[PDB]
């Protein structure tokens, strides 16, 4: 038909504009030349790349990207390992008090950061651990384990373990069976859970803003929150928009590439 098709075209266009208009404002502001940034023109007439040619001249936005990526990867590896070891026991084993562990994990995944930063800043994790990588890997693990447990439990309950019996009908060797029939089945769920943990442990500002001082161990959200401008005597709107666009892309590309995995992982495999 044509009525419903026109309505769906309008709805799709509206959702896309709603979801893209505040990302194409940062870009259109970062490409606007300094002599005319003070024009509300959403379309950047007379673009120029003199706002990105001054963000990388000095390792202040690259070292922060490296620190954020390293912290994300290490906390992702640790959270995936431990949460997998603990989510295989709540998707296959029957022990007393397992509908409580998932609840407690998902509850303390909503712990507020502030109530955590006043004791931490004083602890043994403030006695020679102030701005290093462990000092940030620890609380990021705190907030990243429950997501790993939840996603991996969603990704484990669905695989058919009767395939293990089918395998043990041939040789019955449990090691070779669990390695050649169960591992290649679970692996993509593990990789999707790792992607989700790395995305969720990449945008936190309060902890990385209160426990990070030097050029080492200072994530990207803190490097842009403290950004002031490239030059010291010129208006900083274009330069701050350029920095925001530099920091945003390395994760927008991630989510765009891995969208089919992310949508199915967040929804506990409901949608496909």
């Amino acid at each position: 038909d044509a009525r419903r098709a026109t309505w769906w075209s309008v709805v799709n266009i509206l959702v896309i504009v709603y979801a893209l208009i505040p990302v194409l404002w940062i870009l259109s502001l970062s490409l606007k030349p300094t002599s005319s940034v003070k024009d509300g023109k959403l379309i950047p007439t007379e673009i120029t790349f003199a706002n990105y040619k001054a963000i990388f001249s000095g390792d202040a936005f690259t070292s922060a990207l490296f620190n954020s990526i390293g912290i994300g990867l290490i906390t992702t590896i640790i959270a995936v390992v431990i949460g997998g070891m603990a989510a295989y026991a709540v998707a296959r084993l029957q022990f007393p008090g397992k509908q409580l562990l998932i609840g407690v994990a998902l509850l303390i995944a909503m712990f507020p950061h502030i109530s955590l930063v006043t004791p931490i800043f004083n602890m043994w994790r403030g006695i020679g651990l102030f701005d290093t990588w462990p000092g940030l890997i620890i609380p990021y693990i705190t907030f990243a384990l429950p997501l790993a447990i939840y996603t991996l439990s969603a990704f484990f309950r669905e695989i058919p373990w009767d395939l293990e019996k089918a395998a043990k009908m041939d040789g019955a060797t449990p090691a070779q069976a669990f390695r050649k029939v169960i591992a290649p089945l679970a692996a993509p769920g593990i990789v999707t859970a790792a992607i989700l943990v790395f995305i969720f442990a990449w945008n936190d500002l309060l902890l990385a803003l209160s426990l990070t001082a030097t050029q080492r161990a200072i994530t990207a959200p803190v490097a842009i929150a403290n950004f002031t401008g490239s030059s010291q005597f010129e208006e900083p709107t274009g330069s701050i928009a350029a920095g925001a666009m530099v920091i945003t892309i390395p994760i927008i590309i991630f989510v765009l590439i891995f969208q089919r995995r992310i949508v199915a992982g967040l929804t506990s495999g409901a949608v496909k």
Partner: protein, 384 residues
Amino acid sequence: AEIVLDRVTKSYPRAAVKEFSMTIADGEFIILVGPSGCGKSTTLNMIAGLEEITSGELRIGGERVNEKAPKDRDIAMVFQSYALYPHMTVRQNIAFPLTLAKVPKAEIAAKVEETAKILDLSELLDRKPGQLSGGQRQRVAMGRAIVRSPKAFLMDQPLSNLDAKLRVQMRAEISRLQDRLGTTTVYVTHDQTEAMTLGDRVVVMLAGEVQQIGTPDELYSSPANLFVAGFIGSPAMNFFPATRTDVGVRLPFGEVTLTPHMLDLLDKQARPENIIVGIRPEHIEDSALLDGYARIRALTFSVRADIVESLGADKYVHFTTEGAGAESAQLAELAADSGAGTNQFIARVSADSRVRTGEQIELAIDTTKLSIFDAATGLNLTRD
């Protein structure tokens, strides 16, 4: 090869396979048929080594096996839900119990190709079992089950998840396939149709205990229980209560004094006080078409057919009665699932019967295939 077991058992925190004893030879095709939740799939697993024997022996040809591995117990199961690995390709799915057996790759190629040629999926040997349909998926499962050429070959309701029609074709396929290969089999099912079509012996199981073993004909035309004769013969053979009249048996619609022969044959044991009588639906022949000597000795009766159905080679008429005929020792377990209607019977008539709903019919019951049982223990008196 030659699988002999006896006195096997099980225990659940419950003797699910209590008193099971059989001796399956080479090439035979044994069925293990029973109602839902019975001890059929559990004795299958117990043979396969997935649930250990609680008490008994399982000598599968060579020695005792109840303390051995699946890799040397009765090999080559094929599950119901078609446990087949999706990430692998059909080639690897079929070749798995071969490649796992360290057979070189050229011989793997040849053997898997010829096995997929046994079936009709050779040109499907490159897909993944996520883009396959039920028929070809069942074919993949049985093809994996085939390649080994094992000692014995035990199936688990492979034809339960298929569609409504392909079941008969896959049944003929299984029959021809076991005729070609020639492997000892056990086949668990849930219906009498297949259990009679593809089968060399039958093990009707209720609550775990066997009821009757033997050729499908020996089970249909000579039952030794109410449950066996009310299970086999899909239109459940009609049931009526009565007592002995010292000369025969009496019904509200017929007075059966069959013969002095069966009289003395029934008197050769103790005469119970509550007798149940059963007639197959296929022995009610509508005297309007019974032109012969069987017209007088027919014990005919009349009833208004509530519903008739002409589905082809035979008109099935339904009819109802009165009184109380729900006396049951195994008929209750029978009707727990199918067999609804305390007073509801069905009769098969030839397709030349000008009878319809709403009028009376002279249902002739030729008393020559009568089967009478005791209401107490259900054991047969006429035959064994």
